[PDB]
Amino acid sequence: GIDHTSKQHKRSGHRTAPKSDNVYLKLLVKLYTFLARRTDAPFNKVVLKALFLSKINRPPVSVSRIARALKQEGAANKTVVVVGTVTDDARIFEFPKTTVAALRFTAGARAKIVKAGGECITLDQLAVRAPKGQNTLILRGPRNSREAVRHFGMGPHKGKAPRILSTGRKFERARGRRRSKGFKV
Amino acid sequence: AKSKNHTAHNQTRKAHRNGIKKPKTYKYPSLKGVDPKFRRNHKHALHGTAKALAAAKK
Amino acid sequence: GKSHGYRSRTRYMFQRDFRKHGAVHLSTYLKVYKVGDIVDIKANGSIQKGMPHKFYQGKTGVVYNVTKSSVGVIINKMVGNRYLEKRLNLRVEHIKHSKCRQEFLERVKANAAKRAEAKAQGVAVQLKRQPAQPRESRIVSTEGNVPQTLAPVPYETFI
Amino acid sequence: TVGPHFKQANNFLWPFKLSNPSGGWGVPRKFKHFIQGGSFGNREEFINKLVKSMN
Amino acid sequence: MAHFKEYQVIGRRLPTESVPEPKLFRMRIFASNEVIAKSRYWYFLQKLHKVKKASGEIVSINQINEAHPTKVKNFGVWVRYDSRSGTHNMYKEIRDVSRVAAVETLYQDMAARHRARFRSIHILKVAEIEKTADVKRQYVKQFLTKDLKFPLPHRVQKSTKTFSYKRPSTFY
Amino acid sequence: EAQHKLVFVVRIKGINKIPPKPRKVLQLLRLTRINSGTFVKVTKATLELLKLIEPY
RNA sequence: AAUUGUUGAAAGGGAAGGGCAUUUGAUCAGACA
RNA sequence: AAUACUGCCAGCUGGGACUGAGGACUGCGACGUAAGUCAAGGAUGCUGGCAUAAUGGUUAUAUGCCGCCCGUCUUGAAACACGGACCAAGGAGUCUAACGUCUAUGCGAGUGUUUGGGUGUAAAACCCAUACGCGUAAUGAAAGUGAACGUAGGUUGGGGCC
RNA sequence: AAUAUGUAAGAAGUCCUUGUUACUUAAUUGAACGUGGACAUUUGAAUGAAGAGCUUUUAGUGGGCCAUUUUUGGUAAGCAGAACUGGCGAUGCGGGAUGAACCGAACGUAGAGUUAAGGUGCCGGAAUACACGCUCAUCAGACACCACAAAAGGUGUUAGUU
RNA sequence: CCCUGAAAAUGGAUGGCGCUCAAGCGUGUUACCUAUACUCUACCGUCAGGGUUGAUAUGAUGCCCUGACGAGUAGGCAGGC
RNA sequence: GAGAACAGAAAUCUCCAGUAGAACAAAAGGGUAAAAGCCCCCUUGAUUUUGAUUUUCAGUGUGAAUACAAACCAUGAAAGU
RNA sequence: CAGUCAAGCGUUCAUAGCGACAUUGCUUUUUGAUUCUUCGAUGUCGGCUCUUCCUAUCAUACCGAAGCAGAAUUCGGUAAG
RNA sequence: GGUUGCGGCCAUAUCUACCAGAAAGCACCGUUUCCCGUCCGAUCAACUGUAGUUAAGCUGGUAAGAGCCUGACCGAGUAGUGUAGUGGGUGACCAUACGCGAAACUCAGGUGCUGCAAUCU
Ligand SMILES: [Mg+2]
Ligand SMILES: [Mg+2]
Ligand SMILES: [Mg+2]
Ligand SMILES: [Mg+2]
Ligand SMILES: [Mg+2]
Ligand SMILES: [Mg+2]
Ligand SMILES: [Mg+2]
Ligand SMILES: [Mg+2]
Ligand SMILES: [Mg+2]
Ligand SMILES: [Mg+2]
Ligand SMILES: [Mg+2]
Ligand SMILES: [Mg+2]
Ligand SMILES: [Mg+2]
Ligand SMILES: [Mg+2]
Ligand SMILES: [Mg+2]
Ligand SMILES: [Mg+2]
Ligand SMILES: [Mg+2]
Ligand SMILES: [Mg+2]
Ligand SMILES: [Mg+2]
Ligand SMILES: [Mg+2]
Ligand SMILES: [Mg+2]
Ligand SMILES: [Mg+2]
Ligand SMILES: [Mg+2]
Ligand SMILES: [Mg+2]
Ligand SMILES: [Mg+2]
Ligand SMILES: [Mg+2]
Ligand SMILES: [Mg+2]
Ligand SMILES: [Mg+2]
Ligand SMILES: [Mg+2]
Ligand SMILES: [Mg+2]
Ligand SMILES: [Mg+2]
Ligand SMILES: [Mg+2]
Ligand SMILES: [Mg+2]
Ligand SMILES: [Mg+2]
Ligand SMILES: [Mg+2]
Ligand SMILES: [Mg+2]
Ligand SMILES: [Mg+2]
Ligand SMILES: [Mg+2]
Ligand SMILES: [Mg+2]
Ligand SMILES: [Mg+2]
Ligand SMILES: [Mg+2]
Ligand SMILES: [Mg+2]
Ligand SMILES: [Mg+2]
Ligand SMILES: [Mg+2]
Ligand SMILES: [Mg+2]
Ligand SMILES: [Mg+2]
Ligand SMILES: [Mg+2]
Ligand SMILES: [Mg+2]
Ligand SMILES: [Mg+2]
Ligand SMILES: [Mg+2]
Ligand SMILES: [Mg+2]
Ligand SMILES: [Mg+2]
Ligand SMILES: [Mg+2]
Ligand SMILES: [Mg+2]
Ligand SMILES: [Mg+2]
Ligand SMILES: [Mg+2]
Ligand SMILES: [Mg+2]
Ligand SMILES: [Mg+2]
Ligand SMILES: [Mg+2]
Ligand SMILES: [Mg+2]
Ligand SMILES: [Mg+2]
Ligand SMILES: [Mg+2]
Ligand SMILES: [Mg+2]
Ligand SMILES: [Mg+2]
Ligand SMILES: [Mg+2]
Ligand SMILES: [Mg+2]
Ligand SMILES: [Mg+2]
Ligand SMILES: [Mg+2]
Ligand SMILES: [Mg+2]
Ligand SMILES: [Mg+2]
Ligand SMILES: [Mg+2]
Ligand SMILES: [Mg+2]
Ligand SMILES: [Mg+2]
Ligand SMILES: [Mg+2]
Ligand SMILES: [Mg+2]
Ligand SMILES: [Mg+2]
Ligand SMILES: [Mg+2]
Ligand SMILES: [Mg+2]
Ligand SMILES: [Mg+2]
Ligand SMILES: [Mg+2]
Ligand SMILES: [Mg+2]
Ligand SMILES: [Mg+2]
Ligand SMILES: [Mg+2]
Ligand SMILES: [Mg+2]
Ligand SMILES: [Mg+2]
Ligand SMILES: [Mg+2]
Ligand SMILES: [Mg+2]
Ligand SMILES: [Mg+2]
Ligand SMILES: [Mg+2]
Ligand SMILES: [Mg+2]
Ligand SMILES: [Mg+2]
Ligand SMILES: [Mg+2]
Ligand SMILES: [Mg+2]
Ligand SMILES: [Mg+2]
Ligand SMILES: [Mg+2]
Ligand SMILES: [Mg+2]
Ligand SMILES: [Mg+2]
Ligand SMILES: [Mg+2]
Ligand SMILES: [Mg+2]
Ligand SMILES: [Mg+2]
Ligand SMILES: [Mg+2]
Ligand SMILES: [Mg+2]
Ligand SMILES: [Mg+2]
Ligand SMILES: [Mg+2]
Ligand SMILES: [Mg+2]
Ligand SMILES: [Mg+2]
Ligand SMILES: [Mg+2]
Ligand SMILES: [Mg+2]
Ligand SMILES: [Mg+2]
Ligand SMILES: [Mg+2]
Ligand SMILES: [Mg+2]
Ligand SMILES: [Mg+2]
Ligand SMILES: [Mg+2]
Ligand SMILES: [Mg+2]
Ligand SMILES: [Mg+2]
Ligand SMILES: [Mg+2]
Ligand SMILES: [Mg+2]
Ligand SMILES: [Mg+2]
Ligand SMILES: [Mg+2]
Ligand SMILES: [Mg+2]
Ligand SMILES: [Mg+2]
Ligand SMILES: [Mg+2]
Ligand SMILES: [Mg+2]
Ligand SMILES: [Mg+2]
Ligand SMILES: [Mg+2]
Ligand SMILES: [Mg+2]
Ligand SMILES: [Mg+2]
Ligand SMILES: [Mg+2]
Ligand SMILES: [Mg+2]
Ligand SMILES: [Mg+2]
Ligand SMILES: [Mg+2]
Ligand SMILES: [Mg+2]
Ligand SMILES: [Mg+2]
Ligand SMILES: [Mg+2]
Ligand SMILES: [Mg+2]
Ligand SMILES: [Mg+2]
Ligand SMILES: [Mg+2]
Ligand SMILES: [Mg+2]
Ligand SMILES: [Mg+2]
Ligand SMILES: [Mg+2]
Ligand SMILES: [Mg+2]
Ligand SMILES: [Mg+2]
Ligand SMILES: [Mg+2]
Ligand SMILES: [Mg+2]
Ligand SMILES: [Mg+2]
Ligand SMILES: [Mg+2]
Ligand SMILES: [Mg+2]
Ligand SMILES: [Mg+2]
Ligand SMILES: [Mg+2]
Ligand SMILES: [Mg+2]
Ligand SMILES: [Mg+2]
Ligand SMILES: [Mg+2]
Ligand SMILES: [Mg+2]
Ligand SMILES: [Mg+2]
Ligand SMILES: [Mg+2]
Ligand SMILES: [Mg+2]
Ligand SMILES: [Mg+2]
Ligand SMILES: [Mg+2]
Ligand SMILES: [Mg+2]
Ligand SMILES: [Mg+2]
């Protein structure tokens, strides 16, 4: 037998196909698994994976986050790709041109994207336009804006938000939280 | 009802599963507990050389 | 019950070396430390203030803060199955410059030389350290040196 | 020859996989030194005959 | 410990800047192969000099073939060994035909009569006894008397099948 | 002669009941199973390794 | 079903039953073409 | 001179055993002046026997070797520890309220039709106004105050893209 | 001392130029953070790398026992308590007749071969093999862990010493 | 090496029979026996690395090449009945 | 140790030697000689505000401690403390 | 319960019979120490009965020794018929 | 080279007995009006640098000196120790295998090095 140096029969631990069961999603995967095996172009491997990602690892790219990304230097004509839904944002008053490839655009978002004299491309029209993904700008949403990550890593001096079901005084704001009731965190 | 008292049998075995992580190194470490007077000035002196480099792309 | 205080067990650990007690000699307060110096911790029996804990004795670490009488050293402390970072507020009598790094520097300044002096010559350099290689071929001569036959010797007592 | 590239030339070779020696071991008990009539440690020039029986 | 060969071995205190050409000492080891022989050489040198293998080097290891291997000799042998109660020197006399064939039976005799294994003997000296009557020990002197002869009675024959139809002789 | 510059090592002892340190060197020499066997370049910084695992 | 009578075959020198394998007895599939 | 011993040959050669995976071609070679040939990326050629209980499967028995009673609790059970004579049939992590991580789906700065009304082929499906709930503000015991110096900053790694 | 143990072996490196400040100097002095510039994989030891990093949530467990070495109390204990490692537990296989922990070796289903520990009179596969000695017991002796023997004696015999 | 020192309770244990120039003790030399280990092959399953939507027939969680690994209580998960 | 009326083994005075063989509340172990010991002088920093840090650690708490920051003070010629 | 050395006891004389100081053992009908087995249970003193075994033999058989004249005793061997 | 003020390392500088020290420097040394402190102008303070001295301080040399320092195949590859065995032994303990390796001991050699600044036949 063998002094094993590594845990045998290990599973790789990366998704290998979306866990979702959407026919259309799985078609997109066939588009891109093909594209990615036969194109030697980065952007096809990144997109392929990201299509496998769960809702939590697909935070919404907002429309204003997109707006901003174009203001990067020399970026204003690239076509932005959001593997996941894209949300509207009344907080920008203006919004530029460009062309947004995305899994979904909300009602509000394509409105503003089109209203600005723009285009909303589903992920497979982007394939045709940019087989090597030429001239793309991939955005990710923010993954740790999630509520849950607040409560992760809780413990003393981590300043990390109780799992608590009402709040207010009377709700975990005395002993062990203040110098004058026992101690502090 | 006396019972074993203490031991350390089988605790380097366990230590070396997930195996004593190396300490993790960060360029730009924390200033935690560095001289409060040093920091006051340094904050002002960082604010200065900042300014001097926006004035440098004018 | 058992005893377990801050200085316990440190009997000889904190003692003074032989015929070396009394005040400490002034170079100890002359040496200058700035952030990033490597230091060797060794408590001084005679300076009770700002004394390292017995644990960090013989442990090296790096100064992260410099202050009127003291350096701030961080030291990596493997507790459990990990290492934590501890910052230690030592006094100058208890710290010292680690020569651990000298050999590096005396070899990097030297690794500059050999590099320039050879590049400006016509390449070929090789300046990586190599372990001790086995010995080569040799002829050990016999002239003025005939071999001297030895034997084992019987069993004596002498007492 | 242990030439300039012996590290990558050597590690390229997947660790060898010998049989138990054909003749047998010639010792009676193996886990003593070679000098002490067992099988382990450096036996030098003789590591061969051993190997050419395990191959 | 095995079937023995004699080896001269030669080593010398690894040279230094201020002592190149150190001095060279030889032993004659009685061993089975050359790897044991050098082991013994260092075993014994560190019993006389400030050396170890770590700091010296073998200069030459050479087998020594018996000079007249069809000349029966009378060998005196000098030994030091450890018993279960202390250590002691000895002297025996072995009649055989090469220094090495004698060292073989020595280690056997030492083992059978004095339960001493290889690890506890030291071969102080082996020497060809020139003139007879310097042969001290009796179990040897028996074989040096003139026109010596002797029968081999009650001779016993190695039967090659399980059953026999005769009934043996021991005649001779 | 020149001291030998290259060594060949074959693992003799089986897999189990082996102490932590040499049990490590056996790995770094890729000798993780009985009767397999690798070459090793002879230098002090491995000669010590070689030492550390003679019983096996 | 436990348990029972009959009948039939078979084994049984201080339990019975099981594993690997084969002899022998009984019984059976497939496969030729 | 020989021999022994130790070592090497990409020197010849006999007997014996187990395997025969693969299924067009494709590779690296080898022999030939050449045509072709080959043992070169896994067995083919020739000859015979039965076409059946011959081979094979099941089963009873016998023979070689091996085989302690299972369940449990225990450092340790075949235990001189407990339950268990045998059979059948019942026989043990549920449902609910309120929650954590995770995942799927919908919609998204909002989201939730189902208290209710409308309506129906009537406990279904279909539809819906007003609120409400959670979210979109925080922080202080409270009175209270309340998120752009700046391309929503600077630095250092960052996939991807240019 | 041995064994054990802290740090270091570069790009987060090195060298020149000279910017910021409210700290700090007698002092543009220094400290700290910087802009501009010079040198690439022999870029600074060896061996390995079926990659490395990272997060969230949850089971069982929280009676332990043995072996070598170190080691405390006890005359001791198959006793009670520590240290390091290896084990048993949770693990079958081969050896130790027998046996949780010893030796060997760790298990997918098979075939051929070679072995380990241990063995080869017969039981029992395998030399009533070879070679030198020793031993004769009117309670011989016979293989680690292991299933116990001591001081003291012998003109049994053996080989040695002065 | 052997003997004496050497006394317990059912009858009994170098495992048994038995063995005495041993089948005993020390030591040496070879040959030989056989584990679920080692080497080679086959098959199963696991993990991994690659190849392959081009229609006009049948599976794209599919097909094809390749390598390595396989002990297991409490316990996790998976895929199935 | 060698010296001085009563004065004795021990009262007080002097000189020499003296690495600490003393003392520092307390157990013990460290530590300390122009001191950390003894005699003196001036004192309240045994103070105010709130963080970091070490040991114990879960890297909670409590206890104790270190080094800064910001006050107001003590001492001293001063560096300082 | 049994030894070894033998200073001594024994008129004399170490060992007929004993034996200090020391030291080596054995036994498991003492008593301790331990808590491995049994707490969904091994009926728990003594006697009665009756069997068998051990020997560290009290008697009986045959012996060696004696500080055995005889008689009595004593130490010892083979001995549990 | 000397000396002095300030030093660094802190006995190769220390301890004991002698001896030598030119020049300048240090010293001892003279006084008590004044600041200042003492039971005591001894120490501490002031004034003189005049009135005296190399006695001592101080510097250096001596010694089969003590101490301290350095070294060596001096002891010693010893003691201890990491690793190995189904090694030996009733045990107590002990050989051997691959490595690491003391302390004492004994002999030799040594007896302050040196920085800043002023000064000196
Ligand atoms: Mg995902
Ligand atoms: Mg994200
Ligand atoms: Mg929020
Ligand atoms: Mg959460
Ligand atoms: Mg709250
Ligand atoms: Mg705190
Ligand atoms: Mg209890
Ligand atoms: Mg207990
Ligand atoms: Mg416990
Ligand atoms: Mg205590
Ligand atoms: Mg202590
Ligand atoms: Mg002192
Ligand atoms: Mg204090
Ligand atoms: Mg064979
Ligand atoms: Mg052969
Ligand atoms: Mg063999
Ligand atoms: Mg054996
Ligand atoms: Mg072979
Ligand atoms: Mg040897
Ligand atoms: Mg030696
Ligand atoms: Mg010896
Ligand atoms: Mg024969
Ligand atoms: Mg290697
Ligand atoms: Mg190496
Ligand atoms: Mg070696
Ligand atoms: Mg019967
Ligand atoms: Mg047909
Ligand atoms: Mg030959
Ligand atoms: Mg050949
Ligand atoms: Mg075929
Ligand atoms: Mg085929
Ligand atoms: Mg040709
Ligand atoms: Mg061909
Ligand atoms: Mg048929
Ligand atoms: Mg048939
Ligand atoms: Mg048929
Ligand atoms: Mg047939
Ligand atoms: Mg037929
Ligand atoms: Mg039947
Ligand atoms: Mg059957
Ligand atoms: Mg059986
Ligand atoms: Mg059962
Ligand atoms: Mg129990
Ligand atoms: Mg048990
Ligand atoms: Mg059971
Ligand atoms: Mg029982
Ligand atoms: Mg129970
Ligand atoms: Mg029952
Ligand atoms: Mg049922
Ligand atoms: Mg139930
Ligand atoms: Mg879940
Ligand atoms: Mg969704
Ligand atoms: Mg809203
Ligand atoms: Mg409804
Ligand atoms: Mg109704
Ligand atoms: Mg309607
Ligand atoms: Mg309404
Ligand atoms: Mg609402
Ligand atoms: Mg909220
Ligand atoms: Mg707020
Ligand atoms: Mg407040
Ligand atoms: Mg107000
Ligand atoms: Mg502002
Ligand atoms: Mg403002
Ligand atoms: Mg910066
Ligand atoms: Mg040592
Ligand atoms: Mg290390
Ligand atoms: Mg400026
Ligand atoms: Mg630059
Ligand atoms: Mg490296
Ligand atoms: Mg590598
Ligand atoms: Mg990899
Ligand atoms: Mg858990
Ligand atoms: Mg838990
Ligand atoms: Mg508990
Ligand atoms: Mg728990
Ligand atoms: Mg429990
Ligand atoms: Mg011990
Ligand atoms: Mg115990
Ligand atoms: Mg073990
Ligand atoms: Mg384990
Ligand atoms: Mg258990
Ligand atoms: Mg286990
Ligand atoms: Mg096991
Ligand atoms: Mg077995
Ligand atoms: Mg075995
Ligand atoms: Mg073994
Ligand atoms: Mg039998
Ligand atoms: Mg047989
Ligand atoms: Mg008997
Ligand atoms: Mg007897
Ligand atoms: Mg008996
Ligand atoms: Mg017998
Ligand atoms: Mg033994
Ligand atoms: Mg046994
Ligand atoms: Mg005795
Ligand atoms: Mg004896
Ligand atoms: Mg004798
Ligand atoms: Mg003798
Ligand atoms: Mg014998
Ligand atoms: Mg019985
Ligand atoms: Mg016996
Ligand atoms: Mg036998
Ligand atoms: Mg026998
Ligand atoms: Mg024998
Ligand atoms: Mg042979
Ligand atoms: Mg043979
Ligand atoms: Mg096996
Ligand atoms: Mg198999
Ligand atoms: Mg695929
Ligand atoms: Mg499994
Ligand atoms: Mg299944
Ligand atoms: Mg089903
Ligand atoms: Mg008086
Ligand atoms: Mg008190
Ligand atoms: Mg004290
Ligand atoms: Mg002072
Ligand atoms: Mg007083
Ligand atoms: Mg207070
Ligand atoms: Mg804490
Ligand atoms: Mg915590
Ligand atoms: Mg903690
Ligand atoms: Mg912790
Ligand atoms: Mg608490
Ligand atoms: Mg404290
Ligand atoms: Mg006695
Ligand atoms: Mg006596
Ligand atoms: Mg007498
Ligand atoms: Mg007498
Ligand atoms: Mg008398
Ligand atoms: Mg006597
Ligand atoms: Mg006993
Ligand atoms: Mg007993
Ligand atoms: Mg009794
Ligand atoms: Mg119990
Ligand atoms: Mg009991
Ligand atoms: Mg019971
Ligand atoms: Mg009962
Ligand atoms: Mg009972
Ligand atoms: Mg009963
Ligand atoms: Mg009862
Ligand atoms: Mg008499
Ligand atoms: Mg009478
Ligand atoms: Mg009478
Ligand atoms: Mg008698
Ligand atoms: Mg009777
Ligand atoms: Mg009887
Ligand atoms: Mg003068
Ligand atoms: Mg004065
Ligand atoms: Mg003078
Ligand atoms: Mg003079
Ligand atoms: Mg002076
Ligand atoms: Mg001297
Ligand atoms: Mg020794
Ligand atoms: Mg050792
Ligand atoms: Mg072992
Ligand atoms: Mg042993
Ligand atoms: Mg003893
Ligand atoms: Mg050694
Ligand atoms: Mg000496």
mmCIF file of N, CA and C (backbone and C1' of nucleotides) in Angstrom, chain I residues 124-141:
data_model
loop_
_atom_site.group_PDB
_atom_site.id
_atom_site.type_symbol
_atom_site.label_atom_id
_atom_site.label_comp_id
_atom_site.label_asym_id
_atom_site.label_seq_id
_atom_site.Cartn_x
_atom_site.Cartn_y
_atom_site.Cartn_z
ATOM 1 P P G I 124 -1.425 -32.413 9.284
ATOM 2 O "O5'" G I 124 -0.226 -31.525 8.690
ATOM 3 C "C5'" G I 124 -0.017 -31.480 7.276
ATOM 4 C "C4'" G I 124 1.173 -30.655 6.822
ATOM 5 C "C3'" G I 124 2.546 -31.318 6.913
ATOM 6 O "O3'" G I 124 3.375 -30.865 5.838
ATOM 7 C "C1'" G I 124 2.581 -29.300 8.093
ATOM 8 P P G I 125 3.167 -31.346 4.323
ATOM 9 O "O5'" G I 125 3.104 -29.942 3.566
ATOM 10 C "C5'" G I 125 2.843 -29.830 2.170
ATOM 11 C "C4'" G I 125 3.450 -28.577 1.585
ATOM 12 C "C3'" G I 125 4.947 -28.485 1.724
ATOM 13 O "O3'" G I 125 5.600 -29.031 0.617
ATOM 14 C "C1'" G I 125 3.942 -26.494 2.513
ATOM 15 P P A I 126 6.583 -30.249 0.904
ATOM 16 O "O5'" A I 126 8.032 -29.654 0.581
ATOM 17 C "C5'" A I 126 8.179 -28.354 0.056
ATOM 18 C "C4'" A I 126 9.281 -27.600 0.740
ATOM 19 C "C3'" A I 126 10.225 -28.408 1.604
ATOM 20 O "O3'" A I 126 11.275 -28.947 0.845
ATOM 21 C "C1'" A I 126 9.537 -26.452 2.756
ATOM 22 P P A I 127 11.786 -30.441 1.107
ATOM 23 O "O5'" A I 127 12.693 -30.287 2.378
ATOM 24 C "C5'" A I 127 13.816 -29.435 2.335
ATOM 25 C "C4'" A I 127 15.099 -30.229 2.328
ATOM 26 C "C3'" A I 127 15.399 -31.013 3.595
ATOM 27 O "O3'" A I 127 14.912 -32.333 3.510
ATOM 28 C "C1'" A I 127 17.257 -29.671 3.014
ATOM 29 P P U I 128 13.934 -32.871 4.644
ATOM 30 O "O5'" U I 128 14.876 -33.533 5.738
ATOM 31 C "C5'" U I 128 15.597 -34.737 5.522
ATOM 32 C "C4'" U I 128 16.474 -34.982 6.715
ATOM 33 C "C3'" U I 128 17.534 -36.087 6.617
ATOM 34 O "O3'" U I 128 18.804 -35.557 6.973
ATOM 35 C "C1'" U I 128 16.319 -36.228 8.671
ATOM 36 P P A I 129 19.875 -35.209 5.818
ATOM 37 O "O5'" A I 129 20.093 -33.639 5.982
ATOM 38 C "C5'" A I 129 19.354 -32.716 5.220
ATOM 39 C "C4'" A I 129 20.298 -31.922 4.383
ATOM 40 C "C3'" A I 129 21.704 -31.836 4.914
ATOM 41 O "O3'" A I 129 22.475 -32.981 4.633
ATOM 42 C "C1'" A I 129 20.980 -29.725 4.164
ATOM 43 P P C I 130 23.754 -33.268 5.544
ATOM 44 O "O5'" C I 130 24.690 -31.992 5.331
ATOM 45 C "C5'" C I 130 25.656 -31.952 4.308
ATOM 46 C "C4'" C I 130 26.235 -30.572 4.113
ATOM 47 C "C3'" C I 130 27.303 -30.140 5.083
ATOM 48 O "O3'" C I 130 28.542 -30.752 4.832
ATOM 49 C "C1'" C I 130 25.820 -28.343 4.693
ATOM 50 P P A I 131 29.198 -31.649 5.980
ATOM 51 O "O5'" A I 131 29.932 -30.568 6.860
ATOM 52 C "C5'" A I 131 30.812 -29.673 6.233
ATOM 53 C "C4'" A I 131 31.215 -28.566 7.157
ATOM 54 C "C3'" A I 131 31.417 -28.900 8.616
ATOM 55 O "O3'" A I 131 32.582 -29.662 8.878
ATOM 56 C "C1'" A I 131 30.339 -26.841 8.415
ATOM 57 P P C I 132 32.746 -30.441 10.274
ATOM 58 O "O5'" C I 132 33.072 -29.267 11.283
ATOM 59 C "C5'" C I 132 34.221 -28.476 11.056
ATOM 60 C "C4'" C I 132 34.379 -27.431 12.124
ATOM 61 C "C3'" C I 132 34.313 -27.928 13.549
ATOM 62 O "O3'" C I 132 35.480 -28.596 13.967
ATOM 63 C "C1'" C I 132 32.995 -25.997 13.355
ATOM 64 P P G I 133 35.275 -29.833 14.961
ATOM 65 O "O5'" G I 133 35.437 -29.122 16.373
ATOM 66 C "C5'" G I 133 34.511 -29.409 17.407
ATOM 67 C "C4'" G I 133 34.216 -28.189 18.227
ATOM 68 C "C3'" G I 133 33.417 -28.435 19.491
ATOM 69 O "O3'" G I 133 34.272 -28.847 20.536
ATOM 70 C "C1'" G I 133 32.461 -26.653 18.306
ATOM 71 P P C I 134 33.950 -30.066 21.530
ATOM 72 O "O5'" C I 134 32.830 -29.464 22.473
ATOM 73 C "C5'" C I 134 33.098 -28.268 23.176
ATOM 74 C "C4'" C I 134 31.831 -27.651 23.669
ATOM 75 C "C3'" C I 134 30.925 -28.556 24.478
ATOM 76 O "O3'" C I 134 31.361 -28.720 25.812
ATOM 77 C "C1'" C I 134 29.643 -27.425 22.878
ATOM 78 P P U I 135 31.361 -30.168 26.512
ATOM 79 O "O5'" U I 135 29.812 -30.458 26.825
ATOM 80 C "C5'" U I 135 29.044 -29.511 27.550
ATOM 81 C "C4'" U I 135 27.571 -29.811 27.568
ATOM 82 C "C3'" U I 135 27.148 -31.240 27.800
ATOM 83 O "O3'" U I 135 27.237 -31.637 29.143
ATOM 84 C "C1'" U I 135 25.900 -30.362 26.043
ATOM 85 P P C I 136 27.767 -33.107 29.465
ATOM 86 O "O5'" C I 136 26.462 -33.981 29.346
ATOM 87 C "C5'" C I 136 25.434 -33.835 30.301
ATOM 88 C "C4'" C I 136 24.673 -35.111 30.413
ATOM 89 C "C3'" C I 136 25.572 -36.343 30.522
ATOM 90 O "O3'" C I 136 24.960 -37.323 31.354
ATOM 91 C "C1'" C I 136 24.237 -36.512 28.585
ATOM 92 P P A I 137 25.041 -37.128 32.952
ATOM 93 O "O5'" A I 137 23.648 -36.389 33.278
ATOM 94 C "C5'" A I 137 22.493 -37.086 33.725
ATOM 95 C "C4'" A I 137 21.460 -36.096 34.165
ATOM 96 C "C3'" A I 137 20.060 -36.348 33.655
ATOM 97 O "O3'" A I 137 19.314 -37.131 34.551
ATOM 98 C "C1'" A I 137 20.711 -34.127 33.146
ATOM 99 P P U I 138 19.702 -38.663 34.785
ATOM 100 O "O5'" U I 138 18.325 -39.348 35.144
ATOM 101 C "C5'" U I 138 17.385 -38.651 35.922
ATOM 102 C "C4'" U I 138 17.089 -39.365 37.210
ATOM 103 C "C3'" U I 138 17.881 -38.922 38.439
ATOM 104 O "O3'" U I 138 16.936 -38.695 39.479
ATOM 105 C "C1'" U I 138 17.813 -41.259 38.317
ATOM 106 P P C I 139 16.283 -37.230 39.647
ATOM 107 O "O5'" C I 139 15.750 -36.902 38.202
ATOM 108 C "C5'" C I 139 16.080 -35.663 37.631
ATOM 109 C "C4'" C I 139 14.980 -35.264 36.723
ATOM 110 C "C3'" C I 139 15.042 -33.842 36.176
ATOM 111 O "O3'" C I 139 14.549 -33.872 34.845
ATOM 112 C "C1'" C I 139 12.973 -34.213 37.224
ATOM 113 P P A I 140 15.297 -34.707 33.710
ATOM 114 O "O5'" A I 140 16.326 -33.655 33.176
ATOM 115 C "C5'" A I 140 15.899 -32.401 32.688
ATOM 116 C "C4'" A I 140 17.089 -31.713 32.103
ATOM 117 C "C3'" A I 140 16.832 -30.517 31.225
ATOM 118 O "O3'" A I 140 16.857 -29.359 32.008
ATOM 119 C "C1'" A I 140 18.318 -32.007 30.157
ATOM 120 P P G I 141 15.808 -28.178 31.775
ATOM 121 O "O5'" G I 141 16.136 -27.626 30.315
ATOM 122 C "C5'" G I 141 17.446 -27.186 29.987
ATOM 123 C "C4'" G I 141 17.623 -27.148 28.500
ATOM 124 C "C3'" G I 141 16.437 -26.591 27.754
ATOM 125 O "O3'" G I 141 16.464 -25.182 27.783
ATOM 126 C "C1'" G I 141 17.142 -28.569 26.722
#
